[PDB]
């Protein structure tokens, strides 16, 4: 049987091939040549996951229908928290060491999927996150499945729109990257957000 | 009798006149026009305390002789100044932080101590991320007159900061974005007040 989201780290090799973006995967040992973009001071956009990861994550959340000030479901509520912990400590933490002067990842505060729709935009007030760093993955396709949306970095005076499926944004949680989501004008927009200490 | 370091907030008004830099004091309600400098991205230098504050802090630490063995420091709580420092941070520093950093709200104080660098230090000052959301570093004594060299290297910014004025503070992020090391002094003694705030 084909590997599933749940099979990390038991079926590590197969999981990686199916779920991690080939560009990220091929640079695990050498981030010097990895194609990431500094979109504004100290905020990076980079390929992380494949379309298959994103599609399956959305299916799991849609099917669980455990949606909860924003409409979200914690990874622990669908039994994906141990998998996420593995992703963060094994794959993301070395990339953080590279980006941020050898900063060592301590622990995960929160990991959840957010579903923005036309009834549930949230307040969209600016905030500092409860984290040392925040990871934000776009799970579904701009234009095809939603319009407008995106992210405003208040301090940086920078608007980030049209994030690609499976691409991540990373930024400081507290102090230095005050931010808000932007409203969508149609459809549904799904993101995976994690608050890491 | 003249107000002392200990008399905050009992003798708040007299404490402020004696111990807070007049420029900081006069802008407590509106930092818009306060004369602070961005020395590198997101790192600010600004007047905070008077020479009298700095002199008295050093006296208290010199007299207590509670220095860690021989980097050499003493915690403010070891000389009974932790409640005064709490008052300083929540009442004076926190509003300035709200102004500098997009309304960030100060939660709690991790540590507050005085560091004494002298010529007995035998080993290296390694780079570090601090255990804090933000770090406050006050120069307590005078560059050139009382020590040579010293200062602080912001490694990510590739910026060396040296020769801070007495009673002037540096503020920077603790984690992630302001990797740093202290640089050794080559003569005399350098005293600093450092606080790690969450």
Swiss-Prot record, chain A:
Domain called Fe2OG dioxygenase: residue spans: 107-197
Active-site residues from the entry: 189
Extent of the signal sequence: none
Organism superkingdom: Viruses
Binding site for Fe cation: 127, 129, 179
Entry coiled-coil feature ranges: none
Protein task: Displays two enzymatic activities involved in procollagen processing. Forms hydroxylysine residues in -Xaa-Lys-Gly- sequences in collagens. These hydroxylysines are subsequentially glucosylated by a glucosyltransferase activity. Collagen post-translationally modified is detected in mimivirus virion.
Name under which the protein is recorded: Procollagen lysyl hydroxylase and glycosyltransferase
Native organism taxonomy: Viruses, Varidnaviria, Bamfordvirae, Nucleocytoviricota, Megaviricetes
Whole sequence portion shown: 682 to 895 of 895
């Amino acid at each position: 049987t084909e590997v599933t989201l749940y099979d990390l780290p038991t079926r590590k090799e197969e999981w990686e091939k199916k779920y991690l973006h080939p560009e990220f995967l091929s640079h695990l040992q050498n981030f010097k040549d990895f194609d990431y973009t500094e979109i504004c001071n100290d905020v990076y956009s980079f390929p992380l996951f494949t379309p298959a990861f994103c599609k399956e994550v959305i299916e799991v959340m849609d099917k669980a229908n455990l949606w909860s000030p924003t409409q979200d479901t914690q990874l622990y509520e669908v039994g994906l928290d141990k998998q996420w912990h593995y992703v963060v400590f094994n794959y993301v933490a070395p990339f953080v060491r590279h980006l941020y002067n050898n900063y060592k990842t301590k622990d995960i505060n929160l990991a959840f999927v957010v579903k923005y729709d036309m009834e549930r935009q949230s307040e969209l007030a600016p905030a500092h996150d409860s984290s040392t760093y925040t990871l934000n993955i776009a799970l579904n396709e701009y234009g095809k499945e939603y319009t407008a949306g995106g992210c405003e970095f208040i301090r940086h005076k920078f608007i980030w729109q049209g994030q690609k499926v499976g691409y991540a944004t990373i930024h400081a949680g507290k102090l230095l990257a005050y931010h808000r989501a932007l409203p969508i004008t149609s459809g549904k927009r799904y993101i995976l957000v994690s608050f890491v200490n």
